[PDB]
PDB file of C-alpha atoms and ligand atoms in Angstrom:
ATOM      1  CA  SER A   1      68.434 121.961  82.960  1.00 39.63           C
ATOM      2  CA  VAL A   2      67.359 118.320  82.549  1.00 40.36           C
ATOM      3  CA  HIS A   3      65.352 118.812  85.509  1.00 38.66           C
ATOM      4  CA  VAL A   4      62.179 120.965  84.672  1.00 42.70           C
ATOM      5  CA  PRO A   5      58.930 120.354  86.146  1.00 47.80           C
ATOM      6  CA  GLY A   6      56.905 117.993  84.176  1.00 52.44           C
ATOM      7  CA  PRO A   7      55.571 116.939  81.927  1.00 49.65           C
ATOM      8  CA  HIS A   8      53.484 114.623  84.380  1.00 53.06           C
ATOM      9  CA  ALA A   9      54.367 115.871  87.877  1.00 54.54           C
ATOM     10  CA  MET A  10      52.369 114.493  90.590  1.00 54.98           C
ATOM     11  CA  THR A  11      51.016 116.265  93.450  1.00 55.21           C
ATOM     12  CA  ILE A  12      51.255 114.796  97.098  1.00 53.04           C
ATOM     13  CA  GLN A  13      47.530 113.305  96.894  1.00 54.12           C
ATOM     14  CA  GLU A  14      48.486 111.881  93.369  1.00 55.05           C
ATOM     15  CA  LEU A  15      51.729 110.361  94.720  1.00 56.49           C
ATOM     16  CA  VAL A  16      50.014 108.707  97.620  1.00 59.16           C
ATOM     17  CA  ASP A  17      47.588 107.063  95.129  1.00 57.37           C
ATOM     18  CA  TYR A  18      50.395 106.217  92.829  1.00 55.61           C
ATOM     19  CA  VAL A  19      52.542 104.369  95.515  1.00 57.78           C
ATOM     20  CA  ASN A  20      49.324 102.528  97.053  1.00 60.25           C
ATOM     21  CA  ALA A  21      48.405 101.373  93.614  1.00 57.46           C
ATOM     22  CA  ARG A  22      51.844  99.817  93.250  1.00 57.84           C
ATOM     23  CA  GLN A  23      53.004  98.987  96.472  1.00 59.85           C
ATOM     24  CA  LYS A  24      56.744  98.159  97.465  1.00 63.72           C
ATOM     25  CA  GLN A  25      56.790  95.385  94.961  1.00 64.35           C
ATOM     26  CA  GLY A  26      55.462  97.445  92.170  1.00 65.39           C
ATOM     27  CA  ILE A  27      57.926 100.523  92.885  1.00 63.59           C
ATOM     28  CA  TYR A  28      60.676  97.771  92.901  1.00 64.70           C
ATOM     29  CA  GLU A  29      59.624  96.639  89.494  1.00 65.02           C
ATOM     30  CA  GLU A  30      59.550 100.381  88.383  1.00 67.12           C
ATOM     31  CA  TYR A  31      63.420 100.562  89.247  1.00 65.06           C
ATOM     32  CA  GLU A  32      64.027  97.371  87.421  1.00 64.97           C
ATOM     33  CA  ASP A  33      62.588  98.873  84.367  1.00 64.20           C
ATOM     34  CA  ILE A  34      64.838 101.806  84.647  1.00 67.40           C
ATOM     35  CA  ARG A  35      67.839  99.570  85.196  1.00 67.72           C
ATOM     36  CA  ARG A  36      67.062  97.644  82.356  1.00 68.84           C
ATOM     37  CA  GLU A  37      67.496 100.741  79.887  1.00 65.35           C
ATOM     38  CA  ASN A  38      70.936 101.247  78.055  1.00 65.53           C
ATOM     39  CA  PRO A  39      72.556 104.352  79.404  1.00 67.16           C
ATOM     40  CA  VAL A  40      72.457 107.468  77.264  1.00 66.89           C
ATOM     41  CA  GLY A  41      76.078 107.854  76.330  1.00 67.30           C
ATOM     42  CA  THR A  42      79.732 106.248  76.496  1.00 66.33           C
ATOM     43  CA  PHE A  43      82.361 105.409  78.832  1.00 68.10           C
ATOM     44  CA  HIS A  44      85.500 105.501  76.715  1.00 69.18           C
ATOM     45  CA  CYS A  45      87.571 107.991  78.948  1.00 69.61           C
ATOM     46  CA  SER A  46      87.024 106.012  81.985  1.00 69.84           C
ATOM     47  CA  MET A  47      88.377 102.800  80.525  1.00 71.61           C
ATOM     48  CA  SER A  48      91.209 104.297  78.640  1.00 75.10           C
ATOM     49  CA  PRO A  49      95.110 103.932  79.560  1.00 76.40           C
ATOM     50  CA  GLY A  50      96.092 106.036  82.521  1.00 75.99           C
ATOM     51  CA  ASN A  51      92.465 106.328  83.641  1.00 75.30           C
ATOM     52  CA  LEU A  52      91.420 102.656  84.506  1.00 73.57           C
ATOM     53  CA  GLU A  53      93.661 102.916  87.900  1.00 77.03           C
ATOM     54  CA  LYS A  54      91.766 106.254  88.854  1.00 75.46           C
ATOM     55  CA  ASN A  55      88.264 104.373  89.371  1.00 79.04           C
ATOM     56  CA  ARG A  56      87.687 102.983  92.454  1.00 82.89           C
ATOM     57  CA  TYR A  57      85.268 100.222  90.883  1.00 82.53           C
ATOM     58  CA  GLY A  58      85.990  98.932  87.385  1.00 80.38           C
ATOM     59  CA  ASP A  59      81.809  98.280  86.871  1.00 82.59           C
ATOM     60  CA  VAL A  60      81.381 101.942  87.883  1.00 83.23           C
ATOM     61  CA  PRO A  61      82.948 104.219  85.249  1.00 85.33           C
ATOM     62  CA  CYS A  62      81.535 107.624  84.142  1.00 85.05           C
ATOM     63  CA  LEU A  63      80.051 109.142  81.026  1.00 88.81           C
ATOM     64  CA  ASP A  64      82.105 110.814  78.566  1.00 85.33           C
ATOM     65  CA  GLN A  65      79.450 113.389  77.906  1.00 80.25           C
ATOM     66  CA  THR A  66      79.354 114.835  81.346  1.00 79.36           C
ATOM     67  CA  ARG A  67      82.768 114.255  82.992  1.00 80.02           C
ATOM     68  CA  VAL A  68      84.525 117.079  85.038  1.00 80.01           C
ATOM     69  CA  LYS A  69      87.624 117.495  83.477  1.00 77.23           C
ATOM     70  CA  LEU A  70      90.914 118.689  85.112  1.00 76.06           C
ATOM     71  CA  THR A  71      93.078 121.380  83.332  1.00 75.48           C
ATOM     72  CA  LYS A  72      96.754 120.538  83.976  1.00 77.20           C
ATOM     73  CA  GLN A  73      99.247 112.708  83.413  1.00 77.20           C
ATOM     74  CA  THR A  74      95.531 112.788  82.337  1.00 79.51           C
ATOM     75  CA  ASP A  75      92.512 115.138  82.660  1.00 80.79           C
ATOM     76  CA  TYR A  76      90.462 112.218  84.257  1.00 77.89           C
ATOM     77  CA  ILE A  77      88.594 112.209  87.348  1.00 79.61           C
ATOM     78  CA  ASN A  78      85.611 109.867  88.146  1.00 81.59           C
ATOM     79  CA  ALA A  79      83.100 112.759  88.800  1.00 81.23           C
ATOM     80  CA  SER A  80      80.408 113.971  86.636  1.00 81.09           C
ATOM     81  CA  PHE A  81      78.405 117.207  86.526  1.00 80.65           C
ATOM     82  CA  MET A  82      74.722 116.883  87.627  1.00 78.27           C
ATOM     83  CA  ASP A  83      71.932 119.302  86.885  1.00 78.12           C
ATOM     84  CA  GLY A  84      69.473 120.040  89.889  1.00 78.87           C
ATOM     85  CA  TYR A  85      66.003 121.531  89.691  1.00 75.94           C
ATOM     86  CA  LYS A  86      65.906 124.227  86.986  1.00 72.78           C
ATOM     87  CA  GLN A  87      69.726 124.707  87.613  1.00 72.42           C
ATOM     88  CA  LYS A  88      72.553 123.640  85.473  1.00 73.83           C
ATOM     89  CA  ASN A  89      75.588 121.823  87.077  1.00 74.64           C
ATOM     90  CA  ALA A  90      74.139 122.148  90.679  1.00 75.00           C
ATOM     91  CA  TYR A  91      76.080 118.983  91.797  1.00 75.95           C
ATOM     92  CA  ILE A  92      79.492 116.907  91.011  1.00 74.80           C
ATOM     93  CA  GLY A  93      78.733 113.422  91.685  1.00 70.08           C
ATOM     94  CA  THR A  94      81.937 111.500  92.492  1.00 68.23           C
ATOM     95  CA  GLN A  95      83.554 108.376  93.785  1.00 69.90           C
ATOM     96  CA  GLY A  96      85.268 108.264  97.382  1.00 70.96           C
ATOM     97  CA  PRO A  97      88.632 109.650  96.451  1.00 72.49           C
ATOM     98  CA  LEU A  98      91.619 106.985  96.454  1.00 70.68           C
ATOM     99  CA  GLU A  99      95.002 107.684  97.476  1.00 73.28           C
ATOM    100  CA  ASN A 100      96.243 108.095  93.877  1.00 73.70           C
ATOM    101  CA  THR A 101      93.338 110.837  93.282  1.00 74.16           C
ATOM    102  CA  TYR A 102      93.255 112.918  96.313  1.00 77.93           C
ATOM    103  CA  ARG A 103      95.412 115.514  94.320  1.00 76.36           C
ATOM    104  CA  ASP A 104      92.866 115.050  91.635  1.00 77.57           C
ATOM    105  CA  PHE A 105      89.862 115.741  93.814  1.00 74.27           C
ATOM    106  CA  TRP A 106      91.204 118.826  95.520  1.00 76.55           C
ATOM    107  CA  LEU A 107      92.431 120.112  91.937  1.00 76.18           C
ATOM    108  CA  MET A 108      88.931 119.573  90.926  1.00 75.43           C
ATOM    109  CA  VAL A 109      87.351 121.531  93.897  1.00 77.39           C
ATOM    110  CA  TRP A 110      89.701 124.366  93.237  1.00 76.63           C
ATOM    111  CA  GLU A 111      88.993 124.661  89.444  1.00 77.18           C
ATOM    112  CA  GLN A 112      85.279 124.322  90.018  1.00 76.93           C
ATOM    113  CA  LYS A 113      85.202 126.847  92.742  1.00 77.42           C
ATOM    114  CA  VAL A 114      83.251 124.414  95.080  1.00 79.92           C
ATOM    115  CA  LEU A 115      82.635 125.711  98.465  1.00 74.76           C
ATOM    116  CA  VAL A 116      80.713 122.660  99.855  1.00 76.82           C
ATOM    117  CA  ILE A 117      81.510 118.874  99.985  1.00 76.78           C
ATOM    118  CA  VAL A 118      79.039 116.199 101.065  1.00 78.51           C
ATOM    119  CA  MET A 119      80.130 112.891 102.039  1.00 80.50           C
ATOM    120  CA  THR A 120      77.497 110.152 102.697  1.00 79.96           C
ATOM    121  CA  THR A 121      79.703 107.315 103.933  1.00 80.13           C
ATOM    122  CA  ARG A 122      82.575 106.602 106.431  1.00 79.00           C
ATOM    123  CA  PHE A 123      85.875 105.380 105.296  1.00 77.94           C
ATOM    124  CA  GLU A 124      85.005 102.035 105.773  1.00 76.98           C
ATOM    125  CA  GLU A 125      81.634 100.138 106.502  1.00 76.08           C
ATOM    126  CA  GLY A 126      81.281  96.333 107.001  1.00 77.67           C
ATOM    127  CA  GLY A 127      85.009  96.241 106.055  1.00 77.57           C
ATOM    128  CA  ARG A 128      84.249  97.568 102.663  1.00 79.22           C
ATOM    129  CA  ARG A 129      86.476 100.514 101.734  1.00 76.16           C
ATOM    130  CA  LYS A 130      84.256 103.779 100.425  1.00 76.61           C
ATOM    131  CA  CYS A 131      86.585 106.556 100.849  1.00 77.08           C
ATOM    132  CA  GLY A 132      90.297 107.523 101.580  1.00 77.67           C
ATOM    133  CA  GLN A 133      91.217 110.009 104.261  1.00 76.09           C
ATOM    134  CA  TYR A 134      91.432 113.001 101.961  1.00 76.47           C
ATOM    135  CA  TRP A 135      91.292 115.827 104.394  1.00 76.45           C
ATOM    136  CA  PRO A 136      93.004 116.800 107.634  1.00 71.44           C
ATOM    137  CA  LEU A 137      90.666 115.367 110.455  1.00 71.99           C
ATOM    138  CA  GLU A 138      91.595 117.395 113.577  1.00 71.48           C
ATOM    139  CA  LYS A 139      91.650 121.303 113.776  1.00 73.68           C
ATOM    140  CA  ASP A 140      94.954 122.770 112.814  1.00 73.17           C
ATOM    141  CA  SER A 141      95.978 119.551 110.872  1.00 73.12           C
ATOM    142  CA  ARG A 142      96.861 119.811 107.327  1.00 71.58           C
ATOM    143  CA  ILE A 143      97.733 118.070 104.202  1.00 73.10           C
ATOM    144  CA  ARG A 144      99.814 119.120 101.297  1.00 69.20           C
ATOM    145  CA  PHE A 145      98.928 117.706  97.812  1.00 69.04           C
ATOM    146  CA  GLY A 146     101.725 119.682  95.868  1.00 66.40           C
ATOM    147  CA  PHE A 147     100.578 123.425  95.327  1.00 66.48           C
ATOM    148  CA  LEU A 148      97.242 122.696  97.204  1.00 71.40           C
ATOM    149  CA  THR A 149      97.320 122.726 100.758  1.00 70.36           C
ATOM    150  CA  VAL A 150      94.237 121.819 102.857  1.00 69.61           C
ATOM    151  CA  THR A 151      94.187 122.877 106.512  1.00 67.37           C
ATOM    152  CA  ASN A 152      91.392 122.040 109.204  1.00 68.77           C
ATOM    153  CA  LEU A 153      90.033 125.124 110.778  1.00 65.57           C
ATOM    154  CA  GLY A 154      87.672 123.486 112.834  1.00 67.00           C
ATOM    155  CA  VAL A 155      85.298 120.538 113.419  1.00 67.98           C
ATOM    156  CA  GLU A 156      81.793 120.251 115.027  1.00 65.81           C
ATOM    157  CA  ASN A 157      80.012 116.984 115.862  1.00 66.24           C
ATOM    158  CA  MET A 158      76.035 117.069 115.355  1.00 65.96           C
ATOM    159  CA  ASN A 159      73.698 114.136 116.210  1.00 64.03           C
ATOM    160  CA  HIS A 160      73.357 113.254 112.541  1.00 68.21           C
ATOM    161  CA  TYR A 161      76.364 114.864 110.786  1.00 67.34           C
ATOM    162  CA  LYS A 162      79.739 116.545 111.207  1.00 68.39           C
ATOM    163  CA  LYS A 163      80.644 119.839 109.939  1.00 68.64           C
ATOM    164  CA  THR A 164      84.519 120.554 109.228  1.00 67.26           C
ATOM    165  CA  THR A 165      85.767 123.930 107.817  1.00 66.98           C
ATOM    166  CA  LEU A 166      88.569 123.519 105.694  1.00 68.72           C
ATOM    167  CA  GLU A 167      90.866 126.155 103.822  1.00 67.60           C
ATOM    168  CA  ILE A 168      92.544 125.394 100.695  1.00 63.57           C
ATOM    169  CA  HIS A 169      95.686 127.129  99.644  1.00 61.38           C
ATOM    170  CA  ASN A 170      96.710 127.362  96.166  1.00 61.84           C
ATOM    171  CA  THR A 171     100.414 128.105  96.455  1.00 65.77           C
ATOM    172  CA  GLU A 172     100.867 128.765  92.702  1.00 68.52           C
ATOM    173  CA  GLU A 173      97.855 131.249  92.375  1.00 70.95           C
ATOM    174  CA  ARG A 174      98.450 132.532  95.751  1.00 69.70           C
ATOM    175  CA  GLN A 175      95.020 132.622  96.866  1.00 68.43           C
ATOM    176  CA  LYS A 176      92.926 130.752  99.582  1.00 67.31           C
ATOM    177  CA  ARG A 177      89.390 129.654  99.960  1.00 67.52           C
ATOM    178  CA  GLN A 178      87.287 128.090 102.549  1.00 67.32           C
ATOM    179  CA  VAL A 179      85.421 125.143 101.791  1.00 69.97           C
ATOM    180  CA  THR A 180      82.856 123.443 103.847  1.00 69.38           C
ATOM    181  CA  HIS A 181      82.830 119.431 104.429  1.00 68.15           C
ATOM    182  CA  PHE A 182      79.838 117.737 105.721  1.00 66.96           C
ATOM    183  CA  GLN A 183      79.752 114.114 106.505  1.00 66.60           C
ATOM    184  CA  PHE A 184      76.277 112.660 107.176  1.00 66.60           C
ATOM    185  CA  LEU A 185      76.560 110.136 109.849  1.00 64.55           C
ATOM    186  CA  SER A 186      73.339 108.483 110.087  1.00 63.51           C
ATOM    187  CA  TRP A 187      72.975 106.303 106.884  1.00 61.37           C
ATOM    188  CA  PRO A 188      73.007 102.795 108.030  1.00 59.26           C
ATOM    189  CA  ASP A 189      75.492 100.075 107.477  1.00 60.45           C
ATOM    190  CA  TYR A 190      72.486  97.918 105.935  1.00 58.94           C
ATOM    191  CA  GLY A 191      69.582  99.232 103.825  1.00 61.99           C
ATOM    192  CA  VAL A 192      68.427 102.674 103.556  1.00 60.23           C
ATOM    193  CA  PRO A 193      67.534 105.032 106.764  1.00 56.99           C
ATOM    194  CA  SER A 194      64.330 104.013 108.593  1.00 52.67           C
ATOM    195  CA  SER A 195      63.186 107.713 108.498  1.00 54.01           C
ATOM    196  CA  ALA A 196      64.277 110.407 106.075  1.00 53.28           C
ATOM    197  CA  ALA A 197      63.925 113.086 108.745  1.00 53.70           C
ATOM    198  CA  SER A 198      67.809 113.520 109.578  1.00 54.77           C
ATOM    199  CA  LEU A 199      68.563 113.264 106.011  1.00 53.70           C
ATOM    200  CA  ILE A 200      66.159 115.831 104.822  1.00 53.66           C
ATOM    201  CA  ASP A 201      67.483 118.252 107.912  1.00 55.20           C
ATOM    202  CA  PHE A 202      70.964 117.604 106.486  1.00 57.30           C
ATOM    203  CA  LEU A 203      70.141 118.519 103.185  1.00 55.94           C
ATOM    204  CA  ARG A 204      68.556 121.701 104.702  1.00 56.23           C
ATOM    205  CA  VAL A 205      71.853 122.311 106.499  1.00 55.76           C
ATOM    206  CA  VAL A 206      73.640 122.037 103.164  1.00 57.78           C
ATOM    207  CA  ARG A 207      71.393 124.041 101.202  1.00 53.76           C
ATOM    208  CA  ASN A 208      71.830 126.807 103.533  1.00 53.18           C
ATOM    209  CA  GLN A 209      75.461 126.610 103.941  1.00 53.39           C
ATOM    210  CA  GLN A 210      75.773 126.629  99.930  1.00 53.22           C
ATOM    211  CA  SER A 211      73.544 129.785  99.974  1.00 51.03           C
ATOM    212  CA  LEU A 212      75.695 131.488 102.481  1.00 53.02           C
ATOM    213  CA  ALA A 213      79.018 130.754 101.012  1.00 48.94           C
ATOM    214  CA  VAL A 214      77.919 131.700  97.336  1.00 50.53           C
ATOM    215  CA  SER A 215      76.692 134.910  98.699  1.00 51.83           C
ATOM    216  CA  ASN A 216      79.992 135.641 100.469  1.00 54.35           C
ATOM    217  CA  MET A 217      82.245 134.408  97.491  1.00 53.75           C
ATOM    218  CA  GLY A 218      81.935 137.393  94.961  1.00 55.29           C
ATOM    219  CA  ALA A 219      81.240 137.825  91.349  1.00 58.45           C
ATOM    220  CA  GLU A 220      76.402 128.907  91.290  1.00 62.90           C
ATOM    221  CA  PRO A 221      79.384 126.342  91.792  1.00 58.02           C
ATOM    222  CA  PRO A 222      78.410 122.825  92.284  1.00 57.40           C
ATOM    223  CA  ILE A 223      78.211 121.002  95.572  1.00 57.90           C
ATOM    224  CA  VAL A 224      80.426 118.013  95.366  1.00 57.88           C
ATOM    225  CA  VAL A 225      78.553 114.897  96.648  1.00 56.30           C
ATOM    226  CA  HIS A 226      79.999 111.474  97.447  1.00 52.55           C
ATOM    227  CA  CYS A 227      79.612 108.137  98.583  1.00 52.86           C
ATOM    228  CA  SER A 228      81.663 104.836  97.628  1.00 53.31           C
ATOM    229  CA  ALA A 229      81.084 104.770  93.826  1.00 52.96           C
ATOM    230  CA  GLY A 230      79.160 108.147  93.567  1.00 51.91           C
ATOM    231  CA  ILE A 231      75.895 106.533  92.411  1.00 50.19           C
ATOM    232  CA  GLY A 232      73.706 105.034  95.097  1.00 46.94           C
ATOM    233  CA  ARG A 233      73.736 107.422  98.333  1.00 46.88           C
ATOM    234  CA  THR A 234      74.959 110.201  96.016  1.00 46.80           C
ATOM    235  CA  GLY A 235      71.923 109.789  93.529  1.00 46.96           C
ATOM    236  CA  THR A 236      69.519 109.375  96.421  1.00 43.87           C
ATOM    237  CA  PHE A 237      70.755 112.719  97.987  1.00 42.50           C
ATOM    238  CA  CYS A 238      70.329 114.549  94.887  1.00 40.29           C
ATOM    239  CA  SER A 239      67.223 113.224  93.714  1.00 38.01           C
ATOM    240  CA  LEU A 240      65.651 114.023  96.855  1.00 39.16           C
ATOM    241  CA  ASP A 241      67.000 117.570  96.946  1.00 39.79           C
ATOM    242  CA  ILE A 242      65.487 118.000  93.331  1.00 38.32           C
ATOM    243  CA  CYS A 243      61.985 116.413  94.060  1.00 39.74           C
ATOM    244  CA  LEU A 244      61.959 118.595  97.315  1.00 39.07           C
ATOM    245  CA  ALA A 245      62.761 121.810  95.420  1.00 36.54           C
ATOM    246  CA  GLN A 246      60.129 121.089  92.936  1.00 30.57           C
ATOM    247  CA  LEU A 247      57.836 120.101  95.729  1.00 30.05           C
ATOM    248  CA  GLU A 248      58.487 123.337  97.342  1.00 29.45           C
ATOM    249  CA  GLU A 249      58.025 125.681  94.273  1.00 26.34           C
ATOM    250  CA  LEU A 250      55.049 124.252  92.611  1.00 23.18           C
ATOM    251  CA  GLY A 251      53.737 121.548  95.014  1.00 26.04           C
ATOM    252  CA  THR A 252      54.582 118.660  92.574  1.00 23.54           C
ATOM    253  CA  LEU A 253      57.282 116.217  91.870  1.00 23.66           C
ATOM    254  CA  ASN A 254      58.204 112.979  89.743  1.00 23.62           C
ATOM    255  CA  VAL A 255      60.543 110.490  91.096  1.00 21.55           C
ATOM    256  CA  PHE A 256      60.644 108.476  87.828  1.00 23.26           C
ATOM    257  CA  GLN A 257      61.438 111.437  85.761  1.00 23.61           C
ATOM    258  CA  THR A 258      63.861 112.716  88.213  1.00 21.67           C
ATOM    259  CA  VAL A 259      66.078 109.514  88.659  1.00 22.58           C
ATOM    260  CA  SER A 260      65.779 108.861  84.715  1.00 19.47           C
ATOM    261  CA  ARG A 261      66.991 112.225  83.984  1.00 19.15           C
ATOM    262  CA  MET A 262      69.838 111.888  86.408  1.00 17.96           C
ATOM    263  CA  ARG A 263      71.003 108.840  85.159  1.00 18.14           C
ATOM    264  CA  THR A 264      71.925 110.424  81.714  1.00 16.03           C
ATOM    265  CA  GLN A 265      74.381 112.757  83.844  1.00 17.08           C
ATOM    266  CA  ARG A 266      75.678 110.525  86.721  1.00 18.46           C
ATOM    267  CA  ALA A 267      75.352 106.918  84.976  1.00 18.99           C
ATOM    268  CA  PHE A 268      73.907 104.329  87.408  1.00 18.76           C
ATOM    269  CA  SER A 269      72.641 106.948  89.967  1.00 17.17           C
ATOM    270  CA  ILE A 270      70.302 105.009  92.296  1.00 14.42           C
ATOM    271  CA  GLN A 271      72.017 101.702  92.760  1.00 15.35           C
ATOM    272  CA  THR A 272      69.321  99.405  94.423  1.00 14.91           C
ATOM    273  CA  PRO A 273      65.321  99.146  94.346  1.00 12.43           C
ATOM    274  CA  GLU A 274      65.282  99.675  98.132  1.00 10.76           C
ATOM    275  CA  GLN A 275      67.091 103.211  97.285  1.00 10.84           C
ATOM    276  CA  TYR A 276      64.676 103.734  94.759  1.00 10.38           C
ATOM    277  CA  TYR A 277      61.716 103.198  97.080  1.00  7.31           C
ATOM    278  CA  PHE A 278      63.150 105.215  99.837  1.00  7.45           C
ATOM    279  CA  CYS A 279      63.141 108.102  97.476  1.00  7.82           C
ATOM    280  CA  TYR A 280      59.072 107.729  96.976  1.00  7.73           C
ATOM    281  CA  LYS A 281      58.888 106.951 100.710  1.00  8.30           C
ATOM    282  CA  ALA A 282      61.051 109.661 102.018  1.00  9.49           C
ATOM    283  CA  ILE A 283      58.920 112.101 100.116  1.00  9.62           C
ATOM    284  CA  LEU A 284      55.582 110.630 101.627  1.00 11.66           C
ATOM    285  CA  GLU A 285      57.235 110.897 105.182  1.00 15.42           C
ATOM    286  CA  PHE A 286      58.008 114.185 104.481  1.00 13.54           C
ATOM    287  CA  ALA A 287      54.470 115.024 103.340  1.00 13.09           C
ATOM    288  CA  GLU A 288      53.011 113.707 106.395  1.00 11.73           C
ATOM    289  CA  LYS A 289      55.628 115.317 108.810  1.00 10.21           C
ATOM    290  CA  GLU A 290      54.444 118.601 106.925  1.00  9.05           C
ATOM    291  CA  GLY A 291      50.986 117.982 107.699  1.00  9.74           C
ATOM    292  CA  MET A 292      49.966 117.285 103.951  1.00 13.75           C
ATOM    293  CA  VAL A 293      48.725 113.754 104.603  1.00 13.29           C
ATOM    294  CA  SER A 294      45.093 112.532 105.409  1.00 18.17           C
ATOM    295  CA  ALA A 295      44.803 108.790 105.974  1.00 16.92           C
ATOM    296  CA  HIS A 296      42.153 106.105 105.176  1.00 16.60           C
TER     297      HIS A 296
HETATM  298 CL1   CL B   1      79.873  98.730  92.979  1.00 14.70          CL
HETATM  299 CL1   CL B   2      90.083 103.661 100.061  1.00 16.30          CL
HETATM  300 CL1   CL B   3      78.127 103.890  99.429  1.00 18.52          CL
END
């Protein structure tokens, strides 16, 4: 995995000092330094014939080096393998499926043996389309995508997310699998969450379901995470997961390293300076909530 502890990881004490030193503007400037670096890799497949129309945004291709290939038309989906903390291919980061890519998305989920899907947007926000209706919304509804039929087995609404259990039936291989679809509901239309508590609780729900599902699946597959373009909220979610994992195991983390590394796999991960600052602030809010912080 690209996500190894260090070199140069920081304790919470060190992180407090770091962020105090730089303030909001210094952390924004740090994001701009990241953003100014040329990507590590190329984007030729994304932009090729047959594939352009499969991107939600022309300015957000995916890297050639880490793209998820479909085994079947083309092999292309705008989706990237992403490492997690000491874990190869912990995530697939992807855009909100489009009508013409719903079948590709489900083929990816089947081929990659995905058990959990994490959605961090609504279908439309502020009149901006972010995701198509690629799954059956109500219990017992289904959608057929050629040889993959997806059936809704139940929905539960929580205060900050909703959980939908889906059955994917591959009618060619004659096999069925359950996939859990989690939609986070408390990301605001503007800006970043005012508190990270619900997002971190949601992360814990997702982690636990992944663990449970993997334990039951029999002789890990990635978690699919999406937002509009698969870079902003997706990158934030994954980055916080990685940093909290390291903070759990060793009591250290490094946001700069995490985001820099992630961007070599899902290009453009972390879309705004507010998202970058949120990664720092969320971790410090967490530290406080966990009773790890003394103030001046
Ligand atoms: Cl965009
Ligand atoms: Cl759409
Ligand atoms: Cl988004």
